[PDB]
Design an enzyme around this catalytic site. Structure first.
Site, PDB file in Angstrom:
ATOM      1  N   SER A 146     -39.944 -34.048   8.949  1.00 42.17           N
ATOM      2  CA  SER A 146     -40.538 -33.090   9.561  1.00 42.17           C
ATOM      3  C   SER A 146     -40.925 -33.446  10.967  1.00 42.17           C
ATOM      4  CB  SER A 146     -41.754 -32.255   8.490  1.00 42.17           C
ATOM      5  OG  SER A 146     -42.661 -31.820   9.446  1.00 42.17           O
ATOM      6  N   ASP A 244     -32.701 -25.484   6.844  1.00 38.10           N
ATOM      7  CA  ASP A 244     -33.922 -26.169   6.569  1.00 38.10           C
ATOM      8  C   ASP A 244     -34.947 -24.773   6.445  1.00 38.10           C
ATOM      9  OD1 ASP A 244     -35.524 -28.495   6.988  1.00 38.10           O
ATOM     10  OD2 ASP A 244     -36.272 -27.169   8.340  1.00 38.10           O
ATOM     11  N   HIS A 289     -36.876 -28.302   2.265  1.00 36.54           N
ATOM     12  CA  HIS A 289     -37.698 -28.517   3.224  1.00 36.54           C
ATOM     13  C   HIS A 289     -38.062 -30.290   3.051  1.00 36.54           C
ATOM     14  CE1 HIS A 289     -40.530 -29.166   6.377  1.00 36.54           C
ATOM     15  NE2 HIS A 289     -41.598 -29.167   5.519  1.00 36.54           N
TER      16      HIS A 289
HETATM   17  O1  63Z Z   1     -43.473 -29.175   8.935  1.00 41.16           O
HETATM   18  C1  63Z Z   1     -42.260 -28.280   9.595  1.00 41.16           C
HETATM   19  C2  63Z Z   1     -42.291 -28.748  10.788  1.00 41.16           C
HETATM   20  C3  63Z Z   1     -41.122 -27.944  11.762  1.00 41.16           C
HETATM   21  N1  63Z Z   1     -41.453 -28.907  13.045  1.00 41.16           N
HETATM   22  C4  63Z Z   1     -40.851 -28.794  14.377  1.00 41.16           C
HETATM   23  C5  63Z Z   1     -40.649 -30.115  14.905  1.00 41.16           C
HETATM   24  C6  63Z Z   1     -39.680 -30.087  16.037  1.00 41.16           C
HETATM   25  C7  63Z Z   1     -39.336 -28.873  16.420  1.00 41.16           C
HETATM   26 CL1  63Z Z   1     -38.350 -28.737  18.021  1.00 41.16          CL
HETATM   27  C8  63Z Z   1     -39.581 -27.489  15.956  1.00 41.16           C
HETATM   28  C9  63Z Z   1     -39.145 -26.177  16.461  1.00 41.16           C
HETATM   29  F1  63Z Z   1     -39.608 -25.312  15.476  1.00 41.16           F
HETATM   30  F2  63Z Z   1     -39.726 -26.064  17.518  1.00 41.16           F
HETATM   31  F3  63Z Z   1     -37.704 -26.111  16.474  1.00 41.16           F
HETATM   32  C10 63Z Z   1     -40.237 -27.629  14.513  1.00 41.16           C
HETATM   33  N2  63Z Z   1     -42.458 -29.870  12.726  1.00 41.16           N
HETATM   34  N3  63Z Z   1     -42.797 -29.579  11.685  1.00 41.16           N
END
Ligand code: 63Z
Ligand code: NAG
Length: 345
Positions: A146, A244, A289
């Site tokens: 994640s 995802d 996920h």
């Molecule tokens: O536990 C779920 C989750 C998702 N993200 C996450 C990380 C990087 C990016 Cl770049 C993004 C988005 F939405 F911006 F693309 C989301 N982080 N934790």
């Protein structure tokens, strides 16, 4: 409960609330392989939404309530039955307590209610582990799920540079990014803005070559896998469900009609396209996920190959393609659960 907590000796490297960061460690005396796993769990990008996270997700912002031990699961398991890939490795679990996608380099101060030190936490963990055996390593695999998967992409080359500059050029640094490969696509109903504000709030840092391409104000681009991956020098294995759940969430997708069917199919096609030139990848056609620290991570297969097998084939490839030992495994079927081995839920 086999991994033991160590709070960082450099107590100026802190979680959001100023409590010390740390890591959980299970050593394997015989082994020269080290697995450093970055936990995930979204992020927060301003005072208001960080305050809310502090109320109901405080373990992701503070070490004050951390347990003294954790059980290694999935790729962090020491049992070969659960972890065919690396069961004998030295195991490190790095709790995510910086809410910054592991990008921050900013302290709590009179100007900052919260510290965002994710990039510095990784550097400090590596530094302190070198005195606990990492100095003798042959492979350091920086893994993460994640936000931790995105954290792998943002930090793997910095870990490699760190070890090079400390005088350890023989440690091969590699990355394993799980569920951290996102698309900056259009929502289904009205992500880039979140990261844009996050970087300023966190003082977030991105890999140097990517920073040099996109330049000031546009570093948010380097949080998107298909943009940052081509700039990286370290070998990185990419694990990513084609559908995802977190991607669908940020796309505002929750009897499916034509518009949504076409949206979902186009999302899987786009994800598959971004992986076409990623030689080491595992991308099943499932709505799910994360994968790699769950106990049943061995169950999913693409083209009849499991992820632990794919990762072993990756290991071999880093010793021409290998007979019956593939590393590039991307599903081509166009709908969630067209792969029968998808997690059941
Ligand atoms: O536990 C779920 C989750 C998702 N993200 C996450 C990380 C990087 C990016 Cl770049 C993004 C988005 F939405 F911006 F693309 C989301 N982080 N934790
Ligand atoms: C401790 O951490 C800070 C970064 O937050 C760094 O500037 C400092 O040199 C570190 N020093 C040690 C552990 O000697």
């Amino acid at each position: 409960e086999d991994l033991r907590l160590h709070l960082l000796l450099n107590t100026s490297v802190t979680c959001n609330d100023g409590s010390p960061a740390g890591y959980y460690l299970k050593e394997s005396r015989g082994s020269r392989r080290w697995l450093l796993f970055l936990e995930g769990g979204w992020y927060c990008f301003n005072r208001e939404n960080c305050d809310s996270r502090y109320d109901t997700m405080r373990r992701l912002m503070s070490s004050r309530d951390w347990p003294r031990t954790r059980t290694g699961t999935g790729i962090l398991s020491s049992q070969p039955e659960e972890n065919p890939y690396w069961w004998n490795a030295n195991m490190v679990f790095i709790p995510y307590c910086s809410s910054d996608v592991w990008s921050g380099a900013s302290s709590k101060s009179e100007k900052n209610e919260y510290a965002f030190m994710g990039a510095l936490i990784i550097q400090e963990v590596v530094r302190e582990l070198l005195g606990r055996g990492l100095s003798g390593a042959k492979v350091l695999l920086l893994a993460g799920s994640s936000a931790g998967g995105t954290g792998v992409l943002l930090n793997v080359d910095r870990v490699a540079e760190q070890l090079e500059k400390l005088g350890y050029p023989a440690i091969q640094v590699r990355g394993l990014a799980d569920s951290g490969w996102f698309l900056d696509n259009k929502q289904y109903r009205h992500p880039t803005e979140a990261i844009r504000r996050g970087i300023r709030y966190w003082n977030g840092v991105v890999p140097e070559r990517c920073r040099r391409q996109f330049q000031e104000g546009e570093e948010w681009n380097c949080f998107f896998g298909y943009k940052v991956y081509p700039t990286l020098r370290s070998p990185v294995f990419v694990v990513q469900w084609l559908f995802d759940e977190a991607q669908l969430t940020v796309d505002n997708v929750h009897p499916v009609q034509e518009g949504l069917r076409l949206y979902i199919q186009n999302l899987g096609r786009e994800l598959r396209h971004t992986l076409k030139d990623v030689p080491a990848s595992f991308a099943p056609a499932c709505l799910s996920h994360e994968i790699i620290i769950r106990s049943h991570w061995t169950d999913v297969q693409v083209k009849g190959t499991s992820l632990p097998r794919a990762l072993h084939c990756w290991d071999r490839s880093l010793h021409t393609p290998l007979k019956g030992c593939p590393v590039h495994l991307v599903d081509s079927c166009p709908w969630p659960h067209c792969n029968p081995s998808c997690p059941t839920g």
